[PDB]
């Protein structure tokens, strides 16, 4: 039993809710919140900009030190950093950005990072400003993630389409 509330159950392990991941994180304080990161951990917009703003820029400060030490992530890769005031940990996961020409096949590799954590609050990877079809992202999630994932979808119109079209 966990503290996630109001989710529709999609499969054995995947749950979905129309919710602002920032507000959801602040309420649940999950062990792991997933950020829709880029390889530079520059959290300017989309989910990343919103999560970072909610940390009063502490996420960005921590991220800049991480990059200065380790260099950029790989597309499809991840790193674990602090969750600040939102979660115990933040898993920064880089899905491919279609508006940069990156191979959509890397979306499965990106979701594989979720399997290293028993329970996660997450957005749909590569959705929103990353340019991929959120319906496809949900399919890859369900077919790749085996751990328990709670998906927060900001847009209500999108949430309804994802549910109604789910196979
Ligand atoms: F860049 C994106 C990368 C991945 C997914 C999404 C992106 O764009 C921003 C809007 N989306 C959100 N989804 C869930 N929680 C959210 N909180 C604020 C925005 C937001 C979808």
Please outline the helices and strands:
Blueprint: E1 8-9, E2 14-18, H1 21-28, E3 32-36, H2 46-54, H3 58-70, E4 78-82, E5 89-93, H4 106-112, E6 119-122, H5 134-144, E7 148-153, H6 156-164
Parallel strand pairs: 2-7, 3-5, 6-7
Antiparallel strand pairs: 1-2, 4-5
Helix pairs in contact: 4-5
The structure holds the ligand Fc1cccc2c1OCCN(c1ncnc3[nH]ccc13)C2.
Account of the 3D structure:
The protein is an alpha/beta fold and 167 residues long. It has helices spanning 21-28, 46-54, 58-70, 106-112, 134-144, 156-164, and strands at 8-9, 14-18, 32-36, 78-82, 89-93, 119-122, 148-153. The longest helix has 13 residues, at 58-70. 40% of the residues are buried. Bound molecules: the ligand Fc1cccc2c1OCCN(c1ncnc3[nH]ccc13)C2.
CATH topology grouping:
Leucine Aminopeptidase, subunit E, domain 1
Choose one word for the global shape: globular
Succession of helices and strands = EEHEHHEEHEHEH
CATH superfamily: Leucine Aminopeptidase, subunit E, domain 1
Question: Which class do the helix and strand fractions yield?
Answer: alpha/beta
Binned strand content: 15-25%
Identify the strand order in the major beta sheet.
1-2-7-6
Number of helices: 6
CATH class, named: Alpha Beta
Helix content: 25-40%
Rg from alpha-carbon coordinates? 15 Å
Bound molecules: the ligand Fc1cccc2c1OCCN(c1ncnc3[nH]ccc13)C2
Find the count of extended strands (DSSP E, 2+ residues). Answer: 7
Distance between the termini: 26 Å
Q: Indicate how many domains the architecture comprises.
A: 1
Identify the CATH architecture.
3-Layer(aba) Sandwich
PDB class: viral protein
Keywords: Macrodomain, ADP-ribose, SARS-CoV-2, fragment-based drug discovery, viral protein
Assembly: monomeric
Entry title: PanDDA analysis group deposition -- Crystal structure of SARS-CoV-2 NSP3 macrodomain in complex with CACHE3HI_1717_72
């Amino acid at each position: 039993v966990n503290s996630f509330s109001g989710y529709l159950k999609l499969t054995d392990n995947v749950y979905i809710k129309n919710a602002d991941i920032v507000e959801e994180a602040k309420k649940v304080k999950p062990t792991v919140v997933v950020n829709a990161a880029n390889v530079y951990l520059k959290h300017g917009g989309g989910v990343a900009g919103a999560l970072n703003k909610a940390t009063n820029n502490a996420m960005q400060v921590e991220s800049d030190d991480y990059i200065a030490t380790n260099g950029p992530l790989k597309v499809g890769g991840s790193c674990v950093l602090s969750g600040h005031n939102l979660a115990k940990h933040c898993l920064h996961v880089v899905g491919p950005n279609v508006n940069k020409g990156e191979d959509i096949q890397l979306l499965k590799s990106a979701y594989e990072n979720f399997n290293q954590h028993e329970v996660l609050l997450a957005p749909l990877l590569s959705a929103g400003i990353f340019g991929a079809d959120p319906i496809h992202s949900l399919r890859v999630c369900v077919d790749t993630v085996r751990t328990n994932v709670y998906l927060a979808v900001f847009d209500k119109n999108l949430y309804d389409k994802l549910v109604s079209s789910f196979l």
